[PDB]
């Protein structure tokens, strides 16, 4: 099993921590969702290849510009996370995270991940965003951002309902294996 | 880690650790407040266990088996003994605060009413200065440690077999030399997230909410000082 490194990046409340917990545990925690994710090594079999995928998070490092890059050494795939209920977090994808990731991790594939897709039909989400002259991030808006930033691909998931969670990590494993 | 502590923290939360009959006697807010405190101690136990792997298993293992040049092992495991003392003393205090909180006749039923004071002492004065200077040095030597490990693995045959040997157990899956180094660097950035979630469910006692607010500020000041004093090194 070849060893590959995955790192998730994104604004404070974009669901980057939930996404790792839900995948490593294989379920949305029924009793207590932990606050922090330490690390985890996933045994993934994608398209016939056996890979050992190390999982890392940058939660807590967002305000510390010298400390955060210490997470980047040897990354083989980057999950660029944004939240679908937060159009403002999508604005910081090409103006904040994309220049930094391309500086410390050049040529490393990036997958733009639209988190919290379940919130597209949540009534409270559409009401709160309307008192801002806004609405949930649309699938075509996500694709267009993934296009402009030269992301290897665009994917949507929901850590709450586990929908699309497996497909992101299987795809990230495929991306990491690429020449 | 010692079996006693491992069992006390083997559950996925405080609600699952204490006896269901004891849990059923508390307000839902207390269960949430204790769940996050249980995680602060659970992750502190794992942090100290990571440091023991680096000191006894890797660092000491190379000194007693390999013929490495003097100073290579220090470049590979910077400030590990200093970090180990800092956190083992924090873990000691956290664990005694839980043992004191246990009600008579049980070893698993507890409610930690005061925590803020312990966090204020750990993240202030000499203890805070000692972590600041320690983590500033650790993080500046972090890249150099990773490159040095990779050079030794890609050139030395004996070092290669030592690493394959010690990391073979199933328990060391996510705890190799490089994972241990990043695990320690990321650790300091966990505290504000944990203290903020504890603070959110600690409004019952006003002097506790203020203690946790002072502690939250103290940790953010520490992380800022460490971030300012970082100067990456290269071999
Ligand atoms: C101390 C203890 O384990 N207790 C004490 C008792 C109390 N609140 O006085 O509550 C329960 C319930 C079930 C099991 C043990 C205890």
């Amino acid at each position: 099993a070849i060893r590959k490194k995955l790192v998730i990046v994104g604004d404070g409340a974009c669901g980057k921590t939930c996404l790792l917990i839900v995948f490593s545990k294989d379920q949305f925690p029924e009793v207590y969702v932990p606050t922090v994710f330490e690390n985890y090594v996933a045994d993934i079999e994608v398209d016939g290849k056996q890979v050992e995928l190390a999982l890392w998070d940058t939660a807590g490092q967002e305000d510390y510009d010298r400390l955060r890059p210490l997470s980047y050494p040897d990354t083989d795939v980057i999950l660029m996370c944004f939240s679908i209920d937060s159009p403002d977090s999508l604005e910081n994808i090409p103006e904040k995270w994309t220049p930094e990731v391309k500086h410390f991790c050049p040529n490393v594939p990036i997958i733009l991940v639209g988190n919290k897709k379940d919130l597209r039909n949540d009534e409270h989400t559409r009401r709160e965003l309307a008192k801002m002259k806004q609405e949930p991030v649309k699938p075509e808006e996500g694709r267009d951002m993934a296009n402009r930033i030269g992301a290897f691909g665009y994917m949507e998931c929901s850590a709450k309902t586990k929908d699309g969670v497996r497909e992101v990590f299987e795809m990230a494993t495929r991306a990491a294996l690429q020449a | 880690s010692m079996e006693m502590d491992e069992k006390d923290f083997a559950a996925d939360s405080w609600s699952l650790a204490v006896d269901s009959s004891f849990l059923q006697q508390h307000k839902k807010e207390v269960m949430k407040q204790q769940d996050v405190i249980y995680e602060l101690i659970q992750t502190e136990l794992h942090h100290v266990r990571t440091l023991k792997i680096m000191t006894r298993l890797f660092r000491t293992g190379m000194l007693e088996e390999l013929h490495l040049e003097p100073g290579v092992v220090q470049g590979l495991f910077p400030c590990v003994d200093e970090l180990s003392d800092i956190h083992t003393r924090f873990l000691s205090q956290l664990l005694e605060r839980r043992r004191q909180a246990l009600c008579p006749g049980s070893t698993r039923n507890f409610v930690i009413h005061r925590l803020g004071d312990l966090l204020i002492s750990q993240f202030s004065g000499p203890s805070a200065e000692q972590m600041c200077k320690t983590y500033s040095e650790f993080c500046s030597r972090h890249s150099k440690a990773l490159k040095l490990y990779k050079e030794l693995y890609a050139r030395d045959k004996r070092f290669q077999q030592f690493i394959r040997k010690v990391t073979r157990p199933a328990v060391l899956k996510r705890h190799g030399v490089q994972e241990c180094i990043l695990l320690v660097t990321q650790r300091i950035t966990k505290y504000p997230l944990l203290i903020s979630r504890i603070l959110q469910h600690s409004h019952g006692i006003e002097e506790e909410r203020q203690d946790l607010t002072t502690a939250l500020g103290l940790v953010k000041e520490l992380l800022s000082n460490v971030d300012e004093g970082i100067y990456q090194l290269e071999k």
Side-chain angles (χ1 to χ4, degrees):
Chain A
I2 177 148
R3 166 70 71 95
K4 289 287 135 83
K5 183 183 182 191
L6 184 146
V7 176
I8 194 158
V9 296
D11 280 10
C14 68
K16 48 200 297 277
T17 302
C18 287
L19 182 56
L20 296 161
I21 292 165
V22 151
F23 173 66
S24 49
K25 282 170 162 268
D26 183 31
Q27 43 106 6
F28 189 75
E30 279 201 358
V31 182
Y32 174 74
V33 185
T35 322
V36 301
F37 179 84
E38 297 156 325
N39 78 338
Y40 191 70
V41 172
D43 295 309
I44 302 176
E45 208 178 345
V46 77
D47 289 303
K49 303 123 166 206
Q50 249 284 338
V51 182
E52 245 189 38
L53 200 63
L55 313 182
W56 304 87
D57 193 357
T58 53
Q61 315 192 290
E62 301 99 327
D63 313 327
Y64 310 97
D65 304 324
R66 254 144 290 177
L67 256 160
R68 179 168 70 256
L70 289 165
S71 280
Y72 297 143
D74 295 347
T75 302
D76 300 310
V77 52
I78 291 279
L79 293 175
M80 193 155 293
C81 275
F82 77 75
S83 191
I84 283 162
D85 77 333
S86 172
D88 298 330
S89 76
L90 179 58
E91 185 224 38
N92 312 333
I93 295 300
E95 240 62 83
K96 298 302 150 200
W97 299 97
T98 307
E100 170 179 326
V101 163
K102 277 150 179 208
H103 172 86
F104 294 93
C105 313
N107 289 318
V108 175
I110 294 171
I111 302 175
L112 188 64
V113 183
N115 297 47
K116 314 183 190 174
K117 65 189 184 67
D118 44 290
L119 296 174
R120 277 205 179 105
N121 297 294
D122 179 33
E123 272 293 322
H124 173 257
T125 299
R126 296 192 160 260
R127 290 194 312 261
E128 288 287 311
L129 281 174
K131 323 162 305 160
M132 300 286 286
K133 309 186 191 186
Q134 274 175 345
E135 44 192 356
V137 170
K138 305 163 197 166
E140 71 274 12
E141 288 185 335
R143 297 200 66 82
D144 286 358
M145 185 67 73
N147 230 310
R148 168 192 160 157
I149 69 163
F152 164 96
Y154 178 66
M155 307 200 52
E156 290 179 345
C157 71
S158 156
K160 175 167 227 196
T161 71
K162 281 171 286 181
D163 201 37
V165 172
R166 177 183 41 79
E167 295 94 326
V168 168
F169 292 97
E170 293 190 339
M171 180 62 68
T173 309
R174 175 184 141 183
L177 284 162
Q178 300 301 283
Chain B
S1 203
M2 299 162 246
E3 202 177 339
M4 185 179 67
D5 296 330
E6 293 167 12
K7 288 284 184 82
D8 292 339
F9 288 98
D12 278 356
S13 70
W14 179 91
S15 54
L16 302 164
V18 323
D19 292 325
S20 46
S21 26
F22 180 80
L23 160 67
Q24 283 172 6
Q25 303 170 327
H26 292 90
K27 294 189 187 195
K28 202 221 189 191
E29 189 73 340
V30 184
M31 173 210 57
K32 299 171 156 150
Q33 196 222 351
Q34 298 299 299
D35 266 341
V36 191
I37 294 177
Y38 177 97
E39 185 178 6
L40 176 73
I41 316 168
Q42 196 178 40
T43 62
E44 198 56 34
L45 172 61
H46 303 167
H47 176 62
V48 173
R49 178 156 74 194
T50 291
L51 290 164
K52 299 301 159 84
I53 287 163
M54 292 172 88
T55 47
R56 287 111 165 268
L57 197 60
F58 304 146
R59 196 275 309 277
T60 302
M62 295 171 198
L63 296 176
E64 293 181 336
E65 292 202 1
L66 308 177
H67 301 103
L68 295 177
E69 284 280 282
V72 157
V73 190
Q74 296 179 329
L76 274 185
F77 301 108
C79 345
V80 289
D81 298 300
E82 296 93 84
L83 279 171
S84 181
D85 292 337
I86 288 167
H87 290 276
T88 308
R89 175 176 292 218
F90 190 30
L91 179 62
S92 248
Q93 294 173 316
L94 287 183
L95 294 179
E96 189 56 40
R97 181 64 51 87
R98 176 197 167 268
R99 196 153 303 282
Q100 272 165 345
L102 289 174
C103 49
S106 190
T107 69
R108 48 201 187 230
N109 291 332
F110 72 94
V111 174
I112 296 180
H113 288 305
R114 312 184 175 152
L115 181 61
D117 67 291
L118 213 148
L119 304 174
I120 288 168
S121 183
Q122 174 62 44
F123 299 115
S124 68
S127 61
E129 294 270 65
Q130 199 50 47
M131 298 183 74
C132 186
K133 158 236 176 198
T134 310
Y135 275 96
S136 280
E137 201 101 28
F138 189 79
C139 297
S140 294
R141 308 180 176 280
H142 175 132
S143 280
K144 176 140 172 305
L146 299 177
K147 306 243 201 58
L148 189 54
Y149 166 79
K150 282 179 288 187
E151 184 190 354
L152 289 168
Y153 198 96
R155 274 158 254 268
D156 192 18
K157 141 77 205 163
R158 283 200 63 199
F159 184 89
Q160 232 168 124
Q161 292 278 140
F162 166 81
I163 294 303
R164 289 155 181 171
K165 227 169 71 153
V166 299
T167 60
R168 195 158 296 153
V171 289
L172 283 316
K173 200 190 185 35
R174 51 181 107 154
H175 275 96
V177 173
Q178 300 192 317
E179 287 82 48
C180 294
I181 291 162
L182 188 51
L183 272 163
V184 163
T185 302
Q186 309 219 315
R187 181 60 185 161
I188 43 166
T189 54
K190 306 291 166 165
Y191 298 129
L193 305 160
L194 289 155
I195 307 172
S196 169
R197 196 180 172 184
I198 301 165
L199 174 60
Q200 186 195 258
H201 309 267
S202 290
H203 300 251
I205 314 299
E206 180 51 32
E207 252 277 80
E208 183 60 19
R209 187 206 62 88
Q210 275 174 40
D211 276 35
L212 297 164
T213 304
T214 301
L216 183 64
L218 277 176
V219 179
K220 292 196 207 182
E221 283 161 348
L222 170 70
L223 283 168
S224 171
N225 279 342
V226 174
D227 192 65
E228 209 153 54
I230 279 164
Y231 189 71
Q232 300 252 233
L233 257 46
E234 197 228 14
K235 209 262 98 186

